[PDB]
């Protein structure tokens, strides 16, 4: 809840600005986030979590149809209740 300044680098999380756009790197933990001026979240993530990370950006598999596996684990046809 304490507002900090920027940039910021604690706990292996460099919180930087690149190309006038804000960045959050976690290369130890294998991810790089960022935002643009308008607001467009982006998440770069390694190959280490292939068929692991299940969430709102779906699994990191090859397929694209089966990447709605709910918090229970259920292939759903709706992109909404998921």
């Amino acid at each position: 809840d304490q507002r900090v300044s920027m940039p910021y680098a604690s706990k292996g999380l460099y919180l930087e600005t690149e190309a006038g756009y804000y960045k959050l790197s976690g290369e130890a933990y294998g991810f790089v986030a960022r935002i643009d001026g308008s607001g467009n979240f982006q998440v770069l993530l390694s190959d280490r979590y292939f068929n692991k990370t299940c969430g709102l950006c779906g699994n990191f598999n090859i397929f694209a149809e089966d990447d709605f596996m709910t918090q229970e684990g259920t292939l759903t046809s709706d992109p909404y209740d998921f």
Binding site: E72, T74, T76, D81
Partner: protein, 59 residues
């Protein structure tokens, strides 16, 4: 038919406990079971929830 008695305005629907309420906290009666207005609900194979009075089941 068009009967006579004690009703309450259309925005309000009847609750079991004598008052009538909007459809926000109007429970569901799935399989007889009186579920509260927010009760996420599932066996292994189905998936079901009560939103505003209606019981939204899926599979």
């Amino acid at each position: 038919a068009c009967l006579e008695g004690c009703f309450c305005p259309p925005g309000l629907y009847m609750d079991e406990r004598g008052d009538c309420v909007p459809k926000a906290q109007c429970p569901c009666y799935y399989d007889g079971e009186i579920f509260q207005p927010e009760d996420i609900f599932s066996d292994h194979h189905t998936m079901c929830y009560c939103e505003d009075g209606f019981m939204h089941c899926t599979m």
